[PDB]
Amino acid sequence: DVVEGMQFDRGYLSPYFINKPETGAVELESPFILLADKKISNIREMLPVLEAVAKAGKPLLIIAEDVEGEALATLVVNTMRGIVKVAAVKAPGFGDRRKAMLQDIATLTGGTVISEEIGMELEKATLEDLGQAKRVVINKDTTTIIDGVGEEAAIQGRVAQIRQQIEEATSDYDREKLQERVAKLAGGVAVI
């Protein structure tokens, strides 16, 4: 049976991002998606991004190692007040797998991971670094990215690389987790 969007096992970091109260979900239409390999806690570090998104008139999904402290509190308050349109979730997975799956999302959605591991600054992130998708649906336990806008050639090149990893894997556990990555990418592609 077809895979319906890329879905991963992390849900909203706050119930106040919910914008569909009757179903208990966040539904974002045509959102930009900020991917970052760090915990975000300084609200002043997010201003450039929040500002770019506001001009473009689109909601924002944040996927980061975590979103906490002042940054999280300001996004929650400002979402409740209707000043911003944002939702935040943790990146799925652990260790290297977390990083691999963040880049899988980047590729699917045309975005660039904001990586402090290579010296990137969240504060210099632009609109172009953000991924985009037709929609995102978040509930307590999962996030589903639908129709990523990434280039097909780049999504298939990422799949092919994963399939090489599967051939070269000796662990069934490891093999199953690589297979699951493939299925999520294929589920996230925009068809029609």
Cβ neighbours for 14, distance < 8 A, ≥ 6 positions apart: 72, 76, 88
18 φψ region: left (φ > 0), alpha (ψ -120 to 50), beta (else): beta
**Closest alpha carbon to 36 in 59, 16, 17, 60:** 60
**Closest alpha carbon to 140 in 87, 190, 69, 93:** 87
Return d(Cα 157, Cα 150) in angstroms, integer. 12
Resolution of the experimental model, in Å, one decimal: 2.1
HSE of 101, CA atoms in CB hemisphere, 13 A: 24
Domain that holds residue 132: 1-192
What CATH number did the domain enclosing 11 receive?
Answer: 3.50.7.10
Measuring CA to CA, how many Å separate 89 from each of 61, 65, 67, 164?
Answer: 8, 8, 7, 30
- Largest Cα separation within the chain, whole Å, is 52
Return d(Cα 166, Cα 138) in angstroms, integer. 29
**In contact, 67 and 40? CB cutoff 8 Å:** yes
CA angle, corner 174, sides to 36 and 170, nearest 5? Answer: 140
The per-residue DSSP string of 87-133 comes to EEEEPSSSHHHHHHHHHHHHHHHT---B-GGGT--GGG--GGGSEEE
Return d(Cα 13, Cα 116) in angstroms, integer. 22
State the residue for tokens 């991917």.
35
Number of domains the chain is built from: 1
Return d(Cα 53, Cα 127) in angstroms, integer. 7
